Design an enzyme around this catalytic site. Structure first.
Site, PDB file in Angstrom:
ATOM      1  N   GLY A  16       0.797  -1.215   0.000  1.00  0.00           N
ATOM      2  CA  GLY A  16       0.000   0.000   0.000  1.00  0.00           C
ATOM      3  C   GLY A  16       0.832   1.268   0.000  1.00  0.00           C
ATOM      4  O   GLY A  16       2.037   1.223  -0.241  1.00  0.00           O
ATOM      5  N   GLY A  21       5.483   8.091   1.960  1.00  0.00           N
ATOM      6  CA  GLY A  21       5.667   7.428   0.680  1.00  0.00           C
ATOM      7  C   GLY A  21       4.965   6.088   0.574  1.00  0.00           C
ATOM      8  O   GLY A  21       3.926   5.874   1.191  1.00  0.00           O
ATOM      9  N   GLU A  22       5.537   5.183  -0.214  1.00  0.00           N
ATOM     10  CA  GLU A  22       4.969   3.852  -0.412  1.00  0.00           C
ATOM     11  C   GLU A  22       5.389   2.886   0.699  1.00  0.00           C
ATOM     12  O   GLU A  22       6.360   3.127   1.414  1.00  0.00           O
ATOM     13  CB  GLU A  22       5.401   3.305  -1.776  1.00  0.00           C
ATOM     14  N   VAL A  23       4.642   1.794   0.841  1.00  0.00           N
ATOM     15  CA  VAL A  23       4.925   0.773   1.846  1.00  0.00           C
ATOM     16  C   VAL A  23       4.853  -0.570   1.137  1.00  0.00           C
ATOM     17  O   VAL A  23       3.846  -0.889   0.513  1.00  0.00           O
ATOM     18  CB  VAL A  23       3.886   0.806   2.981  1.00  0.00           C
ATOM     19  CG1 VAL A  23       4.221  -0.251   4.026  1.00  0.00           C
ATOM     20  CG2 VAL A  23       3.858   2.183   3.613  1.00  0.00           C
ATOM     21  N   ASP A 128       0.559   8.761  20.213  1.00  0.00           N
ATOM     22  CA  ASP A 128      -0.282   8.508  19.045  1.00  0.00           C
ATOM     23  C   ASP A 128      -0.784   7.057  19.015  1.00  0.00           C
ATOM     24  O   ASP A 128      -1.020   6.480  17.945  1.00  0.00           O
ATOM     25  CB  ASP A 128       0.535   8.845  17.790  1.00  0.00           C
ATOM     26  CG  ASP A 128      -0.308   8.937  16.524  1.00  0.00           C
ATOM     27  OD1 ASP A 128      -1.519   9.261  16.600  1.00  0.00           O
ATOM     28  OD2 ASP A 128       0.264   8.705  15.436  1.00  0.00           O
ATOM     29  N   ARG A 132      -4.936   1.728  14.556  1.00  0.00           N
ATOM     30  CA  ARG A 132      -4.389   1.920  13.217  1.00  0.00           C
ATOM     31  C   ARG A 132      -2.865   1.938  13.248  1.00  0.00           C
ATOM     32  O   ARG A 132      -2.223   1.727  12.223  1.00  0.00           O
ATOM     33  CB  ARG A 132      -4.899   3.216  12.591  1.00  0.00           C
ATOM     34  CG  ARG A 132      -4.363   4.474  13.230  1.00  0.00           C
ATOM     35  CD  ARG A 132      -4.679   5.701  12.383  1.00  0.00           C
ATOM     36  NE  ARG A 132      -3.762   6.792  12.696  1.00  0.00           N
ATOM     37  CZ  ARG A 132      -3.811   7.520  13.807  1.00  0.00           C
ATOM     38  NH1 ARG A 132      -4.749   7.284  14.718  1.00  0.00           N
ATOM     39  NH2 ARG A 132      -2.899   8.460  14.020  1.00  0.00           N
ATOM     40  N   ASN A 133      -2.291   2.175  14.426  1.00  0.00           N
ATOM     41  CA  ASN A 133      -0.843   2.205  14.562  1.00  0.00           C
ATOM     42  C   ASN A 133      -0.273   0.940  15.200  1.00  0.00           C
ATOM     43  O   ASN A 133       0.867   0.936  15.667  1.00  0.00           O
ATOM     44  CB  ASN A 133      -0.395   3.428  15.372  1.00  0.00           C
ATOM     45  CG  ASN A 133      -0.542   4.725  14.599  1.00  0.00           C
ATOM     46  OD1 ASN A 133      -0.399   4.748  13.374  1.00  0.00           O
ATOM     47  ND2 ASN A 133      -0.809   5.819  15.312  1.00  0.00           N
ATOM     48  N   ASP A 146       4.577   2.794  14.200  1.00  0.00           N
ATOM     49  CA  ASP A 146       4.412   4.224  13.977  1.00  0.00           C
ATOM     50  C   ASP A 146       4.885   5.070  15.158  1.00  0.00           C
ATOM     51  O   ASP A 146       4.090   5.528  15.973  1.00  0.00           O
ATOM     52  CB  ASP A 146       2.944   4.517  13.652  1.00  0.00           C
ATOM     53  CG  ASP A 146       2.482   3.835  12.369  1.00  0.00           C
ATOM     54  OD1 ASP A 146       2.823   4.331  11.267  1.00  0.00           O
ATOM     55  OD2 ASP A 146       1.787   2.793  12.461  1.00  0.00           O
TER      56      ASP A 146
END
Length: 256
Positions: A16, A21-23, A128, A132-133, A146
């Site tokens: 994804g 940037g990209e992962v 944070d 999601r992290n 993250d």
């Protein structure tokens, strides 16, 4: 962090796209599977993009994403970490709605807690913390990732009162975050406070309102969430107490 020769990293698939940037997900030879975060961007991103790896490199715990190394002396600049088959916890729960037992969900929170207890001991504050992290592997082991915001735009509904009010971030405010993460888990990745506006949430919490217990969620777990959401940060349980409480729940399944 440790510099790694690009000739060792072999990308295979692009899982994804992230913020900087990209992962992707390839392999690292010297062979094992690993994650790869590329950067493509201005200097206004590289210093922050890599700083996350620097901090993450100071940690070594089973419930914290392992950093293999980094590639800076060459383009594209990237970060290499342990591979996680199931990815992001929140998305993982939404795709497996009501497909896990209470004990399995508790086990995931136990690990997350253990990773947070590690961080808090390092005098580190994530700031944070959220599903999601948090990444999950084929063994259901959830690890905190993250570390971009860590210190050794943050979602309001996950942030503690004091942190928003007078920018006070500590392991106590991460506990409050952990409280929200607990809610997401037991609710299978449900949006906290639903359609409520950030302003409604702030006011609501000030009035004494607190998220209800997710369906089929054990009373004891929800109470643990209530403690994590105590107004006075000093009254909230320490990560050590949280991990302890969950263990006694796991050891004695009938208490759930």
């Amino acid at each position: 962090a440790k510099e790694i020769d690009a000739s060792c990293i072999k990308i295979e698939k692009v899982i994804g796209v992230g913020e900087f940037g990209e992962v992707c997900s390839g392999r690292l030879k010297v062979e094992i599977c690993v994650a790869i975060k590329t950067l493509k961007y201005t200097d206004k991103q590289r210093r922050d993009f890599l700083s996350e790896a620097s901090i993450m490199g100071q940690f070594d715990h089973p419930n914290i994403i392992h950093l293999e190394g980094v590639v800076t002396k060459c383009k594209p600049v990237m970060i290499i970490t342990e591979y996680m088959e199931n990815g992001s916890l929140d998305a993982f729960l939404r795709k497996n709605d009501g497909r896990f037992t209470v004990i399995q969900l508790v086990g995931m929170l136990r690990g997350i807690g253990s990773g947070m207890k590690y961080l808090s001991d390092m005098s580190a504050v994530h700031r944070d913390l959220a599903a999601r992290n948090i990444l999950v592997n084929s063994n259901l082991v959830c690890k905190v990732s993250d570390f971009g915001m860590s210190r050794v735009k943050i979602p309001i509904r996950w942030t503690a009162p004091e942190a928003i009010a007078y920018r006070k971030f500590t392991s106590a405010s991460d506990v409050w975050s952990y409280g929200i993460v607990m809610w997401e888990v037991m609710s299978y990745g449900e949006r906290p406070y639903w359609d409520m506006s950030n302003q409604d949430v702030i006011k609501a919490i000030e009035e004494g309102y607190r998220l209800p217990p997710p369906m089929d969620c054990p009373i004891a777990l929800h109470q643990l969430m209530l403690d994590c959401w105590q107004k006075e940060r000093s009254d909230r349980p320490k990560f050590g107490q949280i991990v302890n409480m969950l263990d006694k729940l796991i050891r004695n399944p009938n208490s759930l």
